[PDB]
CSV table of C-alpha atoms in Angstrom, one decimal:
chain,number,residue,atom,x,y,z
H,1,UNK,CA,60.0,39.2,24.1
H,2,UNK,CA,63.1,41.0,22.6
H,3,UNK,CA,61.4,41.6,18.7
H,4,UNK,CA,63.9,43.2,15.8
H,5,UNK,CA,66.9,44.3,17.6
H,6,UNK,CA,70.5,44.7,16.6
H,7,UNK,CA,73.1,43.6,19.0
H,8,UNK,CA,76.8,44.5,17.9
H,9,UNK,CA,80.1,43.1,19.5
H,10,UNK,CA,78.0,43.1,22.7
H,11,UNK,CA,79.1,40.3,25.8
H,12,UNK,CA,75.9,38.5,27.1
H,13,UNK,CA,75.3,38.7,30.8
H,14,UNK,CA,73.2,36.7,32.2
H,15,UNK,CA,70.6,38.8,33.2
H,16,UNK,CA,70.0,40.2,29.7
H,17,UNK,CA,68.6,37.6,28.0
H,18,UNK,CA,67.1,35.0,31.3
H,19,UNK,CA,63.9,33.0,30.1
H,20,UNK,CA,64.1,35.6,27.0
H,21,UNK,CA,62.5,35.2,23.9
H,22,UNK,CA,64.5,36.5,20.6
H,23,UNK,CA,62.6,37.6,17.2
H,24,UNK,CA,64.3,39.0,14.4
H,25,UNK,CA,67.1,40.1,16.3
H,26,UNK,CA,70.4,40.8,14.5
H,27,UNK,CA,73.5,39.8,16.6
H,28,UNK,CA,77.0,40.5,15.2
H,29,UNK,CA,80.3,39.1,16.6
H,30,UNK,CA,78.2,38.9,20.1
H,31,UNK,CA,79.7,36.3,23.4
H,32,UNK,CA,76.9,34.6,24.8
H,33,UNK,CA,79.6,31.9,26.4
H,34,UNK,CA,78.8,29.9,29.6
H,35,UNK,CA,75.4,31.5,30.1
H,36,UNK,CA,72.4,29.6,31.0
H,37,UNK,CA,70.4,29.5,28.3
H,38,UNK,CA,68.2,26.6,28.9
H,39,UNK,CA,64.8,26.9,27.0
H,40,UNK,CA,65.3,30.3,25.3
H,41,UNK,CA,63.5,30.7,22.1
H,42,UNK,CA,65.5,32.5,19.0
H,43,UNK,CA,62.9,32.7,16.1
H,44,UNK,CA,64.3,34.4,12.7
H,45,UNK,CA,67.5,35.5,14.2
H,46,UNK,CA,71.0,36.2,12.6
H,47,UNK,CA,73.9,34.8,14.3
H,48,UNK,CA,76.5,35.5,11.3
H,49,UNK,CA,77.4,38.8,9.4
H,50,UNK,CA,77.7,37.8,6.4
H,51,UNK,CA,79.7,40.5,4.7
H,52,UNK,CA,82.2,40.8,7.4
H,53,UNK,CA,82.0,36.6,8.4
H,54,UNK,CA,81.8,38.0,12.2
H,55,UNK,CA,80.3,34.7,14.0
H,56,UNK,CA,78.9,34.5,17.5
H,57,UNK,CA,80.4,32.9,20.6
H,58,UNK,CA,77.8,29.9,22.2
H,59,UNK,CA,81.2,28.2,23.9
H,60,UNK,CA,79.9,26.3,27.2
H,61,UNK,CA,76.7,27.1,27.2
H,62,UNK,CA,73.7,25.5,28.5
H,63,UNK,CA,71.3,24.9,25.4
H,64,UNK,CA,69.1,22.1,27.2
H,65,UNK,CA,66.0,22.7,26.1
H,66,UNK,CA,66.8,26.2,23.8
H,67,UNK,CA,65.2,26.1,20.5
H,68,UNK,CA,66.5,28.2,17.4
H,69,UNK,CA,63.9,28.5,14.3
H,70,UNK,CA,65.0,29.7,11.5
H,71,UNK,CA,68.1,31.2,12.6
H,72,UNK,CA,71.7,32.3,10.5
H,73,UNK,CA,74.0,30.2,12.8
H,74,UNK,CA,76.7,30.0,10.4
H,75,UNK,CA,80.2,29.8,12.0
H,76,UNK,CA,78.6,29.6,15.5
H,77,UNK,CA,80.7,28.1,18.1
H,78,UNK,CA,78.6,25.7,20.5
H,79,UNK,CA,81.5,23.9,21.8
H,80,UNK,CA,81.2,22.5,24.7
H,81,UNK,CA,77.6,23.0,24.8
H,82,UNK,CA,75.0,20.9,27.0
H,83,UNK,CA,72.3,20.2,24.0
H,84,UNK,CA,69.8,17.5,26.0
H,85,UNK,CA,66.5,18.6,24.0
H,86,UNK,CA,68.1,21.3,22.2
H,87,UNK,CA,65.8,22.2,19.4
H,88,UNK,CA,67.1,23.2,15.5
H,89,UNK,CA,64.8,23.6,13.2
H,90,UNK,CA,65.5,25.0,9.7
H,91,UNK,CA,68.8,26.8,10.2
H,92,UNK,CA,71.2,28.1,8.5
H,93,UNK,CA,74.6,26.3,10.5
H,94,UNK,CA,76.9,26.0,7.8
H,95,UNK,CA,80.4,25.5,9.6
H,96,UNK,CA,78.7,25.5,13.3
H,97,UNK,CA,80.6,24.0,15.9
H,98,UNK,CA,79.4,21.4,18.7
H,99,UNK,CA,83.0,19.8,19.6
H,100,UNK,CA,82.8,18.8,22.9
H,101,UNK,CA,78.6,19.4,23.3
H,102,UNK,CA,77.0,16.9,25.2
H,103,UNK,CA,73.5,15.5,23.0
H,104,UNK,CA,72.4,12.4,24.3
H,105,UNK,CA,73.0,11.1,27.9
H,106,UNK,CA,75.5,8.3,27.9
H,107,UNK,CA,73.1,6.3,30.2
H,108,UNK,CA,70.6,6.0,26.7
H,109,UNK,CA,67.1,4.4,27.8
H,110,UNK,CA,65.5,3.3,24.6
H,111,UNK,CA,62.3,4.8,23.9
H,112,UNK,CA,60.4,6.8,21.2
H,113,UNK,CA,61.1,10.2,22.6
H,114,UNK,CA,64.0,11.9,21.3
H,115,UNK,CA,66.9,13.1,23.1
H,116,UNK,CA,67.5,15.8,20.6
H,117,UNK,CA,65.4,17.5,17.5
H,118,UNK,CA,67.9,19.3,14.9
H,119,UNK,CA,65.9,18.8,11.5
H,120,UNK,CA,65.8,21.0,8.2
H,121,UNK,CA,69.3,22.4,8.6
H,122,UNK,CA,72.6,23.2,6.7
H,123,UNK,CA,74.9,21.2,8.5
H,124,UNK,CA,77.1,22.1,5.4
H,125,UNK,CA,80.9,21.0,6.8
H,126,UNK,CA,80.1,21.6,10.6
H,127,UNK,CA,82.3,20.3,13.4
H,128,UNK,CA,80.0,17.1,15.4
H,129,UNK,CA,83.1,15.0,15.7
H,130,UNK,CA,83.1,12.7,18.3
H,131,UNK,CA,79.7,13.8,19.2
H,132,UNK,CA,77.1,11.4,20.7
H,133,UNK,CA,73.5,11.8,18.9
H,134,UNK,CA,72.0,9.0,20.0
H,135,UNK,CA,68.4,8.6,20.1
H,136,UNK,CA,67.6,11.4,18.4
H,137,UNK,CA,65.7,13.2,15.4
H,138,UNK,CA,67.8,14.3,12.7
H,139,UNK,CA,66.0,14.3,9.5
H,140,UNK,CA,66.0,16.8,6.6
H,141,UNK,CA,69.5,17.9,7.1
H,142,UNK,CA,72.3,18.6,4.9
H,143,UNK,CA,76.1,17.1,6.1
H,144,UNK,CA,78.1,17.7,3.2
H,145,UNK,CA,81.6,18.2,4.2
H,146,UNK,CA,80.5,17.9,8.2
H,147,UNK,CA,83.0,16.1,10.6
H,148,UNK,CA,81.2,13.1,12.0
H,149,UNK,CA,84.8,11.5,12.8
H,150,UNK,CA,84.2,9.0,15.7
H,151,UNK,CA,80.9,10.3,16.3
H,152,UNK,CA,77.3,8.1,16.7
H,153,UNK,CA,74.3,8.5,15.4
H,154,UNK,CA,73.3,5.4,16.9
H,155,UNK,CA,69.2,5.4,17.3
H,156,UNK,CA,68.4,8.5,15.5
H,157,UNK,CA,66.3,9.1,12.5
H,158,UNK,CA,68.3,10.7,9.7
H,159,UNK,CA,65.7,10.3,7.2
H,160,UNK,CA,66.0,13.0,4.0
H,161,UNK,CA,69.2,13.9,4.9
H,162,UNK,CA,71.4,14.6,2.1
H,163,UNK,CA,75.2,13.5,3.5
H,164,UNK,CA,77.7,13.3,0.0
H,165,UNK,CA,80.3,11.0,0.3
H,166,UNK,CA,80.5,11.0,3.9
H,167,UNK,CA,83.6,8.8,5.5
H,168,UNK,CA,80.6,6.1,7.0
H,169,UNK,CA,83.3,3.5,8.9
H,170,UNK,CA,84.1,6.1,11.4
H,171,UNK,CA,80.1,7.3,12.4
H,172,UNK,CA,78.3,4.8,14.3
H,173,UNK,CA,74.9,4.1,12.4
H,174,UNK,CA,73.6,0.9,14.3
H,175,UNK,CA,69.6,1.2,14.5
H,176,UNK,CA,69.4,4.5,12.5
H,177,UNK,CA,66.5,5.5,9.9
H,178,UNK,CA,68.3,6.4,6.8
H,179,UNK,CA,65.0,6.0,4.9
H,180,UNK,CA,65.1,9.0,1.8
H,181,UNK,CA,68.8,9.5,1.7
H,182,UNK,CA,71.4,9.4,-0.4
H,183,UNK,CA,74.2,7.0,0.8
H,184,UNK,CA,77.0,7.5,-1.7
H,185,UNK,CA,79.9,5.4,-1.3
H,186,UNK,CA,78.6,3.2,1.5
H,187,UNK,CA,80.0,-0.3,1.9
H,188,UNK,CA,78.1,-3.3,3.2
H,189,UNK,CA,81.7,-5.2,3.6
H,190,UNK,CA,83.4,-1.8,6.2
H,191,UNK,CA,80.2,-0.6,8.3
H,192,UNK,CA,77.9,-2.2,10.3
H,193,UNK,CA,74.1,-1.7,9.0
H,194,UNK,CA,72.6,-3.3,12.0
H,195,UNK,CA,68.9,-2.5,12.9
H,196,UNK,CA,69.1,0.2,9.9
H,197,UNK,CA,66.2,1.0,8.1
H,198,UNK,CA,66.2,1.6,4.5
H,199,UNK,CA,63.5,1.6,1.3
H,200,UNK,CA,63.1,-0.7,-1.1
H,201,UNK,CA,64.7,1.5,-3.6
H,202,UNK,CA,67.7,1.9,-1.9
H,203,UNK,CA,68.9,-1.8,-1.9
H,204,UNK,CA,70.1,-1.6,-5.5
H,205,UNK,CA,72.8,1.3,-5.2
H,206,UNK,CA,74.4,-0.6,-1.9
H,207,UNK,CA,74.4,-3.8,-3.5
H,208,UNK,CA,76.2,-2.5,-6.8
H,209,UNK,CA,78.5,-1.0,-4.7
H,210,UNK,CA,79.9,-4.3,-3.6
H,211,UNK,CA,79.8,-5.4,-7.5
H,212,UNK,CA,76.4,-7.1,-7.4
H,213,UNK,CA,74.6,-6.5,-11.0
H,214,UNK,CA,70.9,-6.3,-10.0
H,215,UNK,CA,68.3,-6.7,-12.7
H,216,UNK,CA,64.3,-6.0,-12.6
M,1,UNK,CA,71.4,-48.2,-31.4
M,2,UNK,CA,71.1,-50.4,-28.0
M,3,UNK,CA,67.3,-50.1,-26.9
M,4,UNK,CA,65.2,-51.7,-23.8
M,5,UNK,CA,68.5,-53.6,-22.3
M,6,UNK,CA,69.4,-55.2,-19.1
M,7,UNK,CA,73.4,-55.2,-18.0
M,8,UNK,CA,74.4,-57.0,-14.8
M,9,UNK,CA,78.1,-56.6,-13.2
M,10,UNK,CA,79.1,-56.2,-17.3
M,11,UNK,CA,82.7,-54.8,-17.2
M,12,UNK,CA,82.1,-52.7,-20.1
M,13,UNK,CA,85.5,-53.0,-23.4
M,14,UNK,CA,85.8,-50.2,-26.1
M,15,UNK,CA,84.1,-52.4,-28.8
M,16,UNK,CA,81.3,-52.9,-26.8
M,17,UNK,CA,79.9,-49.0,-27.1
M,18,UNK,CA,81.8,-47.6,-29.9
M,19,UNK,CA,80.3,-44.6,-30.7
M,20,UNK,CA,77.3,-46.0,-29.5
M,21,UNK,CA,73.8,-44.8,-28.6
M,22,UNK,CA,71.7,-46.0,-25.6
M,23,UNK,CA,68.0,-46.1,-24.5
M,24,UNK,CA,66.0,-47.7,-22.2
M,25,UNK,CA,69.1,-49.4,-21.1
M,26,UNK,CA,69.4,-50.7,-17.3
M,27,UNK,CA,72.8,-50.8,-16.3
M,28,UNK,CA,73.3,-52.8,-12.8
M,29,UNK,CA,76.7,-52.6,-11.1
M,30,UNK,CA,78.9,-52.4,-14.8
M,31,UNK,CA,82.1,-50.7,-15.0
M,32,UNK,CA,82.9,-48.4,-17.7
M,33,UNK,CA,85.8,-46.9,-15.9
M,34,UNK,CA,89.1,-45.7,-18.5
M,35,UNK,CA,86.9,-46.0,-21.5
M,36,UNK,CA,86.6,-42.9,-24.2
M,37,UNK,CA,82.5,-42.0,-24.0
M,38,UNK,CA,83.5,-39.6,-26.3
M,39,UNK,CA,80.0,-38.1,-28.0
M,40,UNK,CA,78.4,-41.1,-26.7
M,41,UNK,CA,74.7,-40.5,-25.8
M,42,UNK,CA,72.3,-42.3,-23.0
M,43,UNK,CA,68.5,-41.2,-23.0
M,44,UNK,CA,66.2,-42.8,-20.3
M,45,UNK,CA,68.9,-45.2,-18.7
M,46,UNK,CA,69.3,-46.3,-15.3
M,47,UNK,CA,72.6,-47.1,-13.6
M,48,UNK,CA,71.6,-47.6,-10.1
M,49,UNK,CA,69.5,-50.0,-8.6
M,50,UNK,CA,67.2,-49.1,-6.3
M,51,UNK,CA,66.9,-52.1,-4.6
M,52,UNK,CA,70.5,-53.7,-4.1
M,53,UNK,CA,71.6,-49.9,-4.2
M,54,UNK,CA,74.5,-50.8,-6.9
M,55,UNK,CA,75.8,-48.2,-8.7
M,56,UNK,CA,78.0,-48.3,-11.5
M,57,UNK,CA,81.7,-47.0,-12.1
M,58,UNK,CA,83.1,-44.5,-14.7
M,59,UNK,CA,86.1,-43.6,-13.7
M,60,UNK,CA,88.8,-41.6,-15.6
M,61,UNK,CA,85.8,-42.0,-18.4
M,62,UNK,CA,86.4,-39.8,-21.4
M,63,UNK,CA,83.1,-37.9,-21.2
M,64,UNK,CA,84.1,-34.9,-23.4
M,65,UNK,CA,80.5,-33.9,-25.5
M,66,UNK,CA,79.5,-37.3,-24.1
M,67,UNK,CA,74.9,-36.6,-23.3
M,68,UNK,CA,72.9,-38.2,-20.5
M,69,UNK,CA,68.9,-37.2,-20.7
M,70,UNK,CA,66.5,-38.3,-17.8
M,71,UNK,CA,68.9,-40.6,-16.6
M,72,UNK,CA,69.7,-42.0,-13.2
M,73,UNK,CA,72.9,-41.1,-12.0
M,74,UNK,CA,72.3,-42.1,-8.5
M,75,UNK,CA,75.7,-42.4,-6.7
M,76,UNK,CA,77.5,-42.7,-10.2
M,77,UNK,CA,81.3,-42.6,-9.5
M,78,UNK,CA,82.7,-40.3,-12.5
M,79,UNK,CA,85.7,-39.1,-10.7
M,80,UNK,CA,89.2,-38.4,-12.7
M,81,UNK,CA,86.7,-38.2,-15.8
M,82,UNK,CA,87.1,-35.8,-18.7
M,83,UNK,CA,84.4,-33.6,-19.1
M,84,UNK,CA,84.8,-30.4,-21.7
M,85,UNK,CA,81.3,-30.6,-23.4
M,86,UNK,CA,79.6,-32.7,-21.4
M,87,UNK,CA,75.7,-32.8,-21.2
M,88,UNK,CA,73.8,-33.7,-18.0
M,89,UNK,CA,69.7,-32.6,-18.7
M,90,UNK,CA,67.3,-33.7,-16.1
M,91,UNK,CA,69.0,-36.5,-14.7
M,92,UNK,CA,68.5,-38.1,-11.1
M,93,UNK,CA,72.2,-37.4,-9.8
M,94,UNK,CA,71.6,-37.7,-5.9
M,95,UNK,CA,75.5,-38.5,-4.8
M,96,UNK,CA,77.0,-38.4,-7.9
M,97,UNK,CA,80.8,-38.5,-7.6
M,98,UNK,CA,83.0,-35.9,-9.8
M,99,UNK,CA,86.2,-35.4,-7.7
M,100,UNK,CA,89.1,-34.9,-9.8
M,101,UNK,CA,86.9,-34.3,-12.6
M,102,UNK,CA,87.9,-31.8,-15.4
M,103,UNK,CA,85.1,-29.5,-17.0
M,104,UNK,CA,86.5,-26.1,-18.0
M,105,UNK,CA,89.8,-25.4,-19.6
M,106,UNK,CA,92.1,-23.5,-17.6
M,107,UNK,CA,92.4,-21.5,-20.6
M,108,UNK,CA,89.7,-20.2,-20.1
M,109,UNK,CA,89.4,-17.7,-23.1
M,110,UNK,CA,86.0,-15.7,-22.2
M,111,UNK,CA,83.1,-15.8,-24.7
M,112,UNK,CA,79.4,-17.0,-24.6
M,113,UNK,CA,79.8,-20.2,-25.3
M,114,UNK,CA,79.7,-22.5,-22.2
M,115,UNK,CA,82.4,-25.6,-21.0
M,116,UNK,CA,79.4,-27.7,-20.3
M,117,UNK,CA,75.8,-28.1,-19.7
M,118,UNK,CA,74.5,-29.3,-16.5
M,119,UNK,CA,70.8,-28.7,-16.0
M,120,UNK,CA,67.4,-29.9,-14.5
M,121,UNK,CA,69.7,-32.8,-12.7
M,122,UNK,CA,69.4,-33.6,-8.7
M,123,UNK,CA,73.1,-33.0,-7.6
M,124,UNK,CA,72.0,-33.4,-3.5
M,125,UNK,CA,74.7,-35.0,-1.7
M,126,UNK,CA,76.9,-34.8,-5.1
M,127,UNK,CA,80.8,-34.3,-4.6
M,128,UNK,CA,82.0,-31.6,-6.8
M,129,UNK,CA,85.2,-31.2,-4.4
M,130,UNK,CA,87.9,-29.1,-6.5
M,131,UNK,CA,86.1,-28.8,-10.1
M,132,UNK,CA,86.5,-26.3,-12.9
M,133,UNK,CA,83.0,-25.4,-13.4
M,134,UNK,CA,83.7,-22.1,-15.0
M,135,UNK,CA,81.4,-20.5,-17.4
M,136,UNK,CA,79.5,-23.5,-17.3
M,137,UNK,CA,75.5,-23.7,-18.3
M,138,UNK,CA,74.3,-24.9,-14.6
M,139,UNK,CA,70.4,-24.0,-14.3
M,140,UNK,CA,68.0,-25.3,-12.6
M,141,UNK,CA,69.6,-28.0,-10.4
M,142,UNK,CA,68.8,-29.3,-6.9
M,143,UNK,CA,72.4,-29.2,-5.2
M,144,UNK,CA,71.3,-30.3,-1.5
M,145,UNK,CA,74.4,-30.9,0.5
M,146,UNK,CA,76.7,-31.0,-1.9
M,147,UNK,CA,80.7,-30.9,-1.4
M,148,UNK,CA,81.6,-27.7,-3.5
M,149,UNK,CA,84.5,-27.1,-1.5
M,150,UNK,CA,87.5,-25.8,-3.3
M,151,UNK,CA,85.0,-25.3,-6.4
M,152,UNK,CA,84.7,-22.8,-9.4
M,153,UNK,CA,82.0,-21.8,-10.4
M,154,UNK,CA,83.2,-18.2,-12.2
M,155,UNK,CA,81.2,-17.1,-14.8
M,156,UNK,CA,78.3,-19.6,-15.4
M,157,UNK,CA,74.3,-19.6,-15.5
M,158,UNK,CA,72.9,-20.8,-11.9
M,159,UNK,CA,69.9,-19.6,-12.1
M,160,UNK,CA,66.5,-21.3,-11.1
M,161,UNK,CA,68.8,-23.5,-8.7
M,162,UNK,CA,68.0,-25.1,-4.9
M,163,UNK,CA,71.3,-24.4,-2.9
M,164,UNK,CA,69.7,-25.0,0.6
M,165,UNK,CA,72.4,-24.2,2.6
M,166,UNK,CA,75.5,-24.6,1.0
M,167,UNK,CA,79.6,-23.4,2.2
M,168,UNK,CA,78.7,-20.6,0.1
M,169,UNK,CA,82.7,-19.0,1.4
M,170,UNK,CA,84.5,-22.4,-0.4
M,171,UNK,CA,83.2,-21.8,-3.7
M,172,UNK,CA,83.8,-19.3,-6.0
M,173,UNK,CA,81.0,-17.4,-7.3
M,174,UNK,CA,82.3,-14.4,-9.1
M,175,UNK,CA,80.5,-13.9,-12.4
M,176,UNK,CA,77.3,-16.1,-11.9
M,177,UNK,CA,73.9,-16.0,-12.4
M,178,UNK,CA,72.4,-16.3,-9.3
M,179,UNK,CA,68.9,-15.3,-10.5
M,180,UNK,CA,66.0,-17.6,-8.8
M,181,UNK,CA,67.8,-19.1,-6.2
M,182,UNK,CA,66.9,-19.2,-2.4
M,183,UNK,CA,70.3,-18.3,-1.2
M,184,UNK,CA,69.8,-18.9,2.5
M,185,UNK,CA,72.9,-17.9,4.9
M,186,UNK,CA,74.9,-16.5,2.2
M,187,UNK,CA,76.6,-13.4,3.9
M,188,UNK,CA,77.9,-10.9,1.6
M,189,UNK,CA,80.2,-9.6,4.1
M,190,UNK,CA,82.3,-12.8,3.9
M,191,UNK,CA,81.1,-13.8,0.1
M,192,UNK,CA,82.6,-12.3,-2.6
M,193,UNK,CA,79.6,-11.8,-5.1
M,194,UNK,CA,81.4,-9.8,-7.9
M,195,UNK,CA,79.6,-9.6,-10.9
M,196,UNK,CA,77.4,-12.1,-10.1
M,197,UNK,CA,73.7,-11.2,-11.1
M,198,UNK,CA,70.7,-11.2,-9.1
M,199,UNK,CA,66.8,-10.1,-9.3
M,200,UNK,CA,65.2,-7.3,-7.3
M,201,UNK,CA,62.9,-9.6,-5.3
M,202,UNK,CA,66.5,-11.7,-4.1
M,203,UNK,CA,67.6,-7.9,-2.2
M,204,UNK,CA,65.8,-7.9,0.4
M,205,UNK,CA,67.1,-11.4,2.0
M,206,UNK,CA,70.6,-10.3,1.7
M,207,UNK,CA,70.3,-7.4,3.4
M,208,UNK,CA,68.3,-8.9,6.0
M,209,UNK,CA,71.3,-11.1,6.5
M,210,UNK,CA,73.6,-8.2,7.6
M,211,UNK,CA,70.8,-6.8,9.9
M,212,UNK,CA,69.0,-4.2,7.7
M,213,UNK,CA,65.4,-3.6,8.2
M,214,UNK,CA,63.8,-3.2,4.3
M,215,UNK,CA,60.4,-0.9,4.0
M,216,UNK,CA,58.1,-0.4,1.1
């Protein structure tokens, strides 16, 4: 247990923080690249310094089975990552990068447990292009901005998630529980809705947006 | 006034209905064809027999403001006929021919005043192949395999009406009320439904259509 500790400009070995647990640590501009951090715990950690925008280095790493809580990850770079039952919850990831991270395993075996848990974070315009989140639990976020360009979210709950005006025909969304969102701009005609699950309430703004004039 | 009359194989002359008013009247195989029906008006009349199966001809009839109430209809030939006005209430129509027929001007100058007036009538197995039926009163009618192909229907009052399954990508439907209808197999990723009006409780089977899953 590693409990309020300020970490600056420091390069991770990985010795320094094996099987560690992390709260209220402070790290500024620090490398944690290509270490093993598979199910590390970071619990009310900071990440980003927000006066002088130094972000952390994540590049590579493995994150299968890590879980932040309440963490500042804004600007961190997770590139590259391997993120099999990575754990988010409630973080601050404005502008966080998972280019090239690995989420769900290609060979996707329906079932009811999720490949992935990232829920109740700013997601405010982070990098997920072409990233696979298949299968897993991504409610309560916030996307506005985010790059979901050729990416899938094929399988996953999304519910509460607030997205804007996200470009929907190039995200996959087949089987997905956008239940409690908002779904500006979305068109019936351009993206495939199979298997998605939606309210009652919802109907009305998708249908008007193909010209529809729905009445009580 | 012509009242509780039988007409067999009659090839109907001008003189012979004049401005004229029929009811009770049983026509059995007559022609009327190229005569001006102009504001003529036929209440509980018959024109097909049910046993022979004779129907009766009005072809290139003017029809214009002409009014047929509870009448049968049954395999009527009205094709080439002139139409503007015309009233059809709660008429037995099954195969009614209006091919060639013209109802709504092509100068079509938008208002709330409709073209014609086609309601409570069983149009099943009707040919309606290339009509003007543009903001038209059309409530309430059965329309069972009928030919709309090539068809207008912009603008007017459907509502209340049976389609089963109709060619719903051969007609046009832009502007109409489609409020109380089953609309069964109509895709609106291939329909164009702009403008057209619809109820709440009619949502849900749409969506359906396209593979969405609708929740309370």
């Amino acid at each position: 247990m590693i409990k309020d500790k300020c970490f600056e400009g420091v390069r991770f070995e990985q010795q320094d923080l094996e099987g560690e647990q992390f709260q209220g640590c402070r790290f500024i501009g620090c490398n944690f690249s290509w270490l093993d951090l598979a199910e590390c715990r970071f619990v009310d950690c900071s990440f980003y310094d927000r006066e002088s925008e130094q972000s952390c280095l994540l590049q590579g790493c493995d994150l299968r089975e890590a879980s932040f809580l309440r963490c500042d990850l804004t600007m961190a770079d997770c590139s590259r990552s391997q993120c099999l039952g990575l754990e988010l919850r409630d973080c601050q990831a404005l502008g966080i990068n998972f280019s090239r991270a690995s989420f769900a395993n290609q060979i996707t075996v329906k079932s009811y447990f999720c490949e992935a848990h990232l829920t109740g974070n700013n997601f405010s315009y982070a990098n997920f292009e072409g990233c696979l989140l298949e299968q897993c639990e991504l409610s309560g976020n916030r996307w506005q901005g985010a790059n979901l360009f050729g990416a899938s979210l094929a399988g996953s709950d999304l519910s509460g998630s607030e997205f804007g005006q996200i470009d929907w025909a190039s995200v996959n969304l087949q089987g997905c529980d956008l239940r409690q969102c908002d779904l500006p701009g979305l068109d019936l005609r351009r993206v495939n809705l199979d298997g998605v699950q939606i309210n009652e309430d919802q109907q009305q703004a998708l249908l008007e947006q193909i010209g529809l004039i729905v009445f009580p």
